[PDB]
């Protein structure tokens, strides 16, 4: 009588301790290497973008116009978007960027700033609705006759919520000290702003810039989170972009960037801008930026383990 | 791989089986129950390792307009890092998993030999080769109580003993 | 004859390369759970700062006022410790507040500033003391009459010593521009700055702010460190709260932020916010951010080690 | 866990032991030798890993006042990361260690059985339960002689060939 | 017949998972300590800056002027280097110094600023040549003569390439309001700039600052990256320091920090400060700062593996 | 280290060798078949370690002009961290191949021991410590073929069986 083990005539070959090459009965992967080029959203509250950039649904652009209020689990952003019909930028754009991707979405509240003594409907054809418009969320205050002063005025916002409110101001820089006065009156014109966290202030910077939309004045975007019960106030003269309505994130979520369609009809966490990782692999090869709940990202195209014992034939 | 110079691709029954040769005739059967005891081990290594983390991470970089360098820098520094200690890990992993798989396999002959040469007293001696030397022919009722480990270890004895 | 090895009735679950849950003879944990609710500082020169917040122990507010030259091995800082009496903050502030940290205390030096053409004396009641006052290591520069100009002016101060030093001035904003003239006459007013490190310039902002201790007004607070022998230059014409005193850091030291009282019973170089760990163990699941020399942070409550063989029972 | 079938509670006196059954009476002795170099492997692991850095770490966070988002980002992010890899680390070491604590303490065992085998030349026979058989009544001189390695390899011989 | 292993008198002491100080037939080391004190460059295009700053490589004081179109794989920063004659300093200053370390060197071209309404040619003592000149890639614009004003201007400069543009510009910080208009003439001076990336505005600020090379003034440097087609545009009125040629990355490149002699006998991929490790082990214990393809740093001097068996003699 | 009580530090040849004495007179000779097997197995441990990473890794430091103290800061908690990792790494990495160098070192004998113990079928008994017992003077034509595994396992059987 004889005892033995069994065998193949095609074995697998794998790495180990010892042995570079070594052929085995049976192996599997251990590097995920297979990506589904969709956002696969099955039961999830899913919002993408398109058009409107994430900054921009604070403040409203029209392409964020549909987007004010909105509510995620995933929220998606897409190469396309802007944050911006009038040309700027926000100042710390990326943190604030961060924190909407997992605010689980907006929610909106008047602050209920009221205006004697200056104009209030600022406009340009940057923001097309109707007929020109501005950002929903804000508002351009100027001076009451085609010149003339502007106050300098006070307000405060009272957080009376149980969470951090997001403040949006922005600063006019205009494309000429001519511009500047046209709209606002002449000398130097001065911002402050406070909280308990707090404390800065804003001068305008009028001179030319290169036309985006064929306008040559940016739009200063800035913004601070004010805490429950603490207060917030606006010296200012002109030169200025008051915020309207103020934001409260509703939960929890996480942003994606991508350039593939939506599905609903795959179930994923781990996400990256071709795709979703399914994969119940505790490595990955497909990319290193890959978000959610993943397998870790590897330098190796593949790492082959034992699944069998070792083979030797005839 | 030494003695038992080579393997059986014909045993598609599992993973160690019989082989005997009496006047009787032929035979091969798997050894389930050595069979599974290794089946069950690897089973347990893939289960420690198709592994799902609750950890979810965000997003610290930008890929449709640029951080700052500086901070762009750290963070595609820092993850690099990471990149290179998880290639690390995982072939290192693979590599210490699959000697020990391998190693964990061999060891399950080994012990099965050990076991049916235990079971057959003075009865048979060790050819060279991993097989075993019966001095009196064995029939085809005293194959599958070697096999179901029932054969008597003296009531066979004498009779072998003078050959 | 018989030979064996020995067994238990009841013995502990552990986890192998191949199997999740076999028993063995002994085991022993290896994740730390237990801590202790105090900052165990035992053989370590000490202090706790308490109301006296970390930055504060170099402009001097009240609170600080026993701490002005501090030296310590372990530095503590408590949540009801406040940095200032008159409502302002720091720039960059957590780069200074990480230098304290390490410092083991600092040793003050009189900078010598004298003043001609010039009041001296500003004071608050935010700063309270016999009566009001200000910060200690600080000098509250004004214009002679309760109205009227401040000449622009210099001062330098050479650092002498061997180790870089820390210096100090603030910056003022009134709530008005009207309150701005009445302390410093009219007109823009420009601080600026230098070393050999270091090239800055600053102008003050006011307008009302939040009222905090009743006042509106902010101080900002700023920094730069002077290296041996390279000097520093003061350019100024108002709105300025001097240095009276510069900085040394006096070693080295650690620095803890907690809530539990100190106690000089026990041994700890691992500290958290609510404690000390007190472990020979290579890991922890207590707290992801202690700091000092600890076991290394895991997810895990728990990771069983043999200490014993294999166990089977009859 | 295989032919020494199971294990005995009883042997409260150290990890291994022998027990005979004689004529004589009965016994149940450790091997104190055997039982030390096992225990001073497993002290050797404990000495490997109660382990203490004499790295400081210091804060780069702040809990009373939050430090600004993007960096606050990017420091949760590495220590995040950081944790991952740790954890990784923790569990695979133990369960490494203690496959070989495990493995380690068998083989102790297997190879405390073949010296014996090896002092009783032909004077004894394997049962396959990891029990010995004389074919002469050994009394119980004899035992702690065959326990402190002494006993008589050929001047016992003879007697037992014939039986 | 007997069968057995090999052996020797003296053997090496190693560490096992199990046992602490086990001998071996043979082990080796595992942990480089081997340094080389020199910079191996052979095959490689290297650049030593010598006194030459890595950022004066773009603004063009006279220790630069040999390496204003350098094209390097190996770039060389020594301590002595300096990126500046006339006293200043960048703003966002190491950001550019790692984007310069891997650029591979860069390429000039003209952005052709031509100058009506002006002076042009401002020099000092500080950057001499054959006599006293300025930094060889920018412009020190004025006013016409001895004091008088200076013309609100724009200048653009588009970005023709397939590649980022580096543009740089200065501000000048003069001694005084006093100098400040004796050179562009009185009242508040404003640069603006902007891109689509873009968007900031300077003003200077005058005052005294310590003597360095018997000069107080400094000149601020800034910087951004003009996309390929993407225009750049210069509001100012005055104090300003003009790009005379923009900068384009030439390909790929490291940078190190040395103060050891270069030596093209040897070659490299590891380097530190005080020369090149070469070496073919996991690990190193030099110096934990080491760029380019480095075994890794540990804190271990050493961790010897076994190459032989056991080691038992008679 | 047990029954092999000890090495021979004469067995300069290789690291297995025979050791015989019969009549004929003496003999050591390595078996370069265990020794090569053993060697190209510490040689596969030191291709998969004299390792080179195509990793380049760039400076975000600055030696001569310090950066920014809260990045600076974040940076040096960052490298102290991936250090204290890879100084993990590699003690362990270390401790765990010794042991597995060692433990198959070994494994190399055991398992040359119980093939030579396999050729020589009932012509020879286990002495206790690792040496083999021949009942009939063996010449030195019949050693190499001990050693060149050709041996007869029942051409000198008879003979010795008697004695
Ligand atoms: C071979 O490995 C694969 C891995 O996916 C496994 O599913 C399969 O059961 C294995 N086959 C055998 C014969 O065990
Ligand atoms: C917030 O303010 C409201 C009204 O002033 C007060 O009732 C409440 O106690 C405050 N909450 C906290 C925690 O400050
Ligand atoms: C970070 O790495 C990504 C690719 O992984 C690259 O696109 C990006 O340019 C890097 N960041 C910086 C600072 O350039
Ligand atoms: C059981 O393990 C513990 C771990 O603390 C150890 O102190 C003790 O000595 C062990 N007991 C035995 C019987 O070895
Ligand atoms: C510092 O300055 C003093 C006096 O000017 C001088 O004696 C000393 O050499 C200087 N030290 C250094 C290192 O610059
Ligand atoms: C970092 O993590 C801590 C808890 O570990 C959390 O309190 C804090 O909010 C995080 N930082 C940021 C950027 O929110
Ligand atoms: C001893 O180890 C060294 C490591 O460099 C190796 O080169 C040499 O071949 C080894 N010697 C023997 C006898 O194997
Ligand atoms: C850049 O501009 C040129 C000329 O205006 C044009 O031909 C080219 O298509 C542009 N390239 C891109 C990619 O914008
Ligand atoms: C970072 O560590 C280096 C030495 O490794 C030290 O010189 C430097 O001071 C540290 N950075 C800071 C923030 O001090």
Do not use: H, M, Y
């Given at each position: 009588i004889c005892l033995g083990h069994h065998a193949v005539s095609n074995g697998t070959k794998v790495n180990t301790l010892t042995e570079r090459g070594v052929e085995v009965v049976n192996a599997t992967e251990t590097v995920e290497r297979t990506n589904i080029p969709?956002?696969?959203?099955?039961g999830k509250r899913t919002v993408d973008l398109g058009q409107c950039g994430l900054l921009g649904?604070?403040?409203?652009?029209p392409q964020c116009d549909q987007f004010l209020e909105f509510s995620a689990d995933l929220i998606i952003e897409r190469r396309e978007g802007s944050d911006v019909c009038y040309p700027g930028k926000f100042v710390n754009e990326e943190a604030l960027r961060q924190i909407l991707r997992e605010s689980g979405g907006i929610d909106k509240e008047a602050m209920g700033f009221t205006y004697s003594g200056i104009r209030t409907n600022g406009a340009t054809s940057?923001?097309?609705?109707?007929?020109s418009s501005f950002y929903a969320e804000m508002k351009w205050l100027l001076s009451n006759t085609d010149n003339a002063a502007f106050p300098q005025m006070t307000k405060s916002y009272k957080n009376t919520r149980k969470s951090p409110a997001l403040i949006v101001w922005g600063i006019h820089h205009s494309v000429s000290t001519a511009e500047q006065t046209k709209l606002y009156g002449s000398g130097n014109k001065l911002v402050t702003v406070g909280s308990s966290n707090y404390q800065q202030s804003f001068v305008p910077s009028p001179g030319a810039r290169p036309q985006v939309n064929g306008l040559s004045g940016r739009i200063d975007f800035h913004w601070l989170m004010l805490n429950p019960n603490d207060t917030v106030t606006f010296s200012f003269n002109g030169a200025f972009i008051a915020p309207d309505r103020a934001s409260f994130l509703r939960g929890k979520s996480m942003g994606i960037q991508s350039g593939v369609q939506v599905d609903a009809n795959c179930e994923g966490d781990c996400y990256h801008s071709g795709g979703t990782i399914i994969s119940?692999?505790?490595?990955?090869?497909?990319?290193?930026?890959?978000?959610?709940?993943?397998?870790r990202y590897v330098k190796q195209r593949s790492l082959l383990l034992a699944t069998g014992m070792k083979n030797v034939p005839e | 791989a030494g003695f038992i110079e080579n393997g059986w691709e014909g045993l598609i029954d599992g993973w160690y089986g019989f082989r005997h040769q009496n006047a009787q005739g032929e035979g091969t059967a798997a050894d389930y129950k050595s069979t599974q005891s290794a089946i069950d081990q690897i089973t347990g290594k893939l289960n420690r390792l198709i592994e799902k983390t609750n950890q979810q991470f965000e997003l610290?970089?930008?890929?449709?307009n640029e951080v700052e360098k500086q901070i762009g820098n750290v963070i595609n520094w820092t993850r690099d890092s990471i990149t290179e200690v998880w290639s690390y890990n995982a072939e290192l992993l693979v590599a210490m998993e699959n000697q020990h798989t391998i190693d964990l396999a061999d060891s399950e002959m080994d012990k099965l030999y050990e076991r049916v040469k235990r079971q057959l007293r003075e009865n048979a001696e060790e050819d060279g080769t991993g097989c075993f030397e019966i001095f009196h022919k064995c029939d085809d009722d005293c194959m599958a109580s070697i096999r179901n480990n029932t054969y008597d270890h003296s009531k066979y004895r004498e009779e072998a003993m003078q050959n």
């Open positions: 969709r956002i696969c959203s099955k649904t604070i403040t409203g652009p940057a923001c097309r609705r109707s007929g119940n692999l505790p490595f990955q090869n497909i990319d290193s930026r890959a978000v959610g709940k993943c397998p | 610290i970089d930008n890929e449709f």
